[PDB]
Design a protein around this nucleic acid. Sequence first.
DNA 1: GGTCTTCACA
DNA 2: CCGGTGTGAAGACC
DNA 3: GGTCTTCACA
DNA 4: CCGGTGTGAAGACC
Lengths: 338, 338
Amino acid sequence: PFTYSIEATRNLATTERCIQDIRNAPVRNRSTQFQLAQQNMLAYTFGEVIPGFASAGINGMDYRDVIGRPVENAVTEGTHFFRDDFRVDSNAKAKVAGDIFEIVSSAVMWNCAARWNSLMVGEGWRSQPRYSRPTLSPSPRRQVAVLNLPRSFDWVSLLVPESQEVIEEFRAGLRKDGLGLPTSTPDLAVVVLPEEFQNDEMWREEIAGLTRPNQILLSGAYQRLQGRVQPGEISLAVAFKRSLRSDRLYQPLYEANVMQLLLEGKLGAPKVEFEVHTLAPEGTNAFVTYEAASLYGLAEGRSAVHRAIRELYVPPTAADLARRFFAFLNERMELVNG
Amino acid sequence: PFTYSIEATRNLATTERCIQDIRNAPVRNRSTQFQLAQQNMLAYTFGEVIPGFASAGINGMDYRDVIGRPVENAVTEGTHFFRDDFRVDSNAKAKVAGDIFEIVSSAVMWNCAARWNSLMVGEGWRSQPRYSRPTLSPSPRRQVAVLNLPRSFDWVSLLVPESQEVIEEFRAGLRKDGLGLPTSTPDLAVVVLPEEFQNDEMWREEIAGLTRPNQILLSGAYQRLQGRVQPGEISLAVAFKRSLRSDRLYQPLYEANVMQLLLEGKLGAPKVEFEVHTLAPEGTNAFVTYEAASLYGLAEGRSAVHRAIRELYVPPTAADLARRFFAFLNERMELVNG
DNA sequence: GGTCTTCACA
DNA sequence: CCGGTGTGAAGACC
DNA sequence: GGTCTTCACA
DNA sequence: CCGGTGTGAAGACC
Ligand SMILES: [Mg+2]
Ligand SMILES: [Mg+2]
Ligand SMILES: [Mg+2]
Ligand SMILES: [Mg+2]
């Protein structure tokens, strides 16, 4: 659980434990001995707790301490089972911490979107944790879906085929000369729910924990909307980064530049709302560096110039992130007619 | 020395040693105990040896083995001095190794440029190591300068003022709307020698080793060329990266895109030659990703489309790097009138 | 076609 | 995915 | 001035 | 500046 019960760890299967001993099964070019099964620790620590929608002692806890509990629970378990032999490299912890931060933030945003959809359908406003009720007029057409994009996802398959044809032709013309348009997958994307799923109940209910079925449900939700989202319904794109460095911050800038070039220069979309979340921006000047012009149309000067990154946000708590997302939805869905 | 002489380490002053004890002088927010003095290790290991311009055993040695000698020499010294207490974190070693790679490669390129200039001012072709003599016609107007750019360098101050005013006006127009154009400084830049430095004897003499005076000479050779280089004499720009990851390769792409936007779309330069030098590209797909198009001129598609990165190079030895640079000089400076 | 082993992505 | 660095320029602080 | 301390960059 | 990582998908293999 969230507090490392000893009896709960005892009653786990060997394949369900947070740490897997692979000392007798080495990896090809790695010297790993004990590996961190991040899905197991997500199901263990957050199996029945979702930050921001849990007891008030977890919703107000520092967000740096909520993201960082699974790793220390794993360390405790590994020390219990493999005493004086347990050792996990710091780089493994860094990777797993980044992944856990992204997944937990996505789960919080999913619960917020589920509450918003339940309100919009006209089923009242839930009040188990106290959040401000939006002033927007309820309407089923103003429903959203939060998609956790996979590793090598190009995010163009979410567009309608008539919107994919232009992108395909442009990429084929680029390939004719042997060139390409590589990009990293944005961590998250929020889109308006298509007209066919306006009655489905899977977009109206909240998950009680990050169990393995719920992890699969959250991870596989992108496949339901493939080839269905209009180009103008891409509400928000989020790039999570648990920590920033003066050189590591250029990856989201490149992702945003490529996405805006594809969505604005070719599809005529109004604008792309790309933002970056972080937990420790100290030691850098990201608040000024991210105040950068989009590398699209600068050489011609015929379109309006704007920031490539909408905003850099540092959530202190999960409840603050939930409130920010609710305010963003209330502000954004106003201009969409329904 | 290059092989960790014990008597040579005994003769070093306490401030000239490869490892500094800062256990009694902690840093503000770091837990460092022993610090790797990278300049001291550079002066110790390569104080009388330059790879590619030394004995045939060092020239033909694996480049991954030359880049990595200073770190292990420092580790041996630290074990000798602080036994059973010495410990250096792997991240410090990674940082130092990257810096060593960049600096030694820049030194090799500087020696190649010095020999090229000495040949092209009609002083003959040095032959202590055997390299192919270029077939180009000698002329003083074709000498080159290799510049190791420092951190937070604008690299536009190298341009003549008339060229600088265009970039300044563009940046002021960007700033008026509250925007900006941030970038990282390319690790190196090769430019044609200005007409006032043709008769200088500093650009023809090679260095015997990476002693501290030579380090200062190579690091500070960019101040001499501020406001002298025309916007069309930027021959080559090189980004050094010891190893490539599937996300760390997007920072050179951003650097190249910004550089080409500034030089091709705002100054009328023919083309910018940007290439990446790596030692371990295994584990990623970089020979295909780096085969990408420039995010400039694709909004309307009027100018010809070309690659952002010229080539990704993996040098096996230092002699191969010297030969590549000589071939590049012979091929490129042929198109300079005179 | 079905199970295992490896590799790129992030 | 990230976290631990070495150094040169800017910043107190008399 | 000018000397020691701190911070951002890469 | 970089090196040690977990996982899903593609590649062998009677
Ligand atoms: Mg990602
Ligand atoms: Mg991310
Ligand atoms: Mg650099
Ligand atoms: Mg570099």
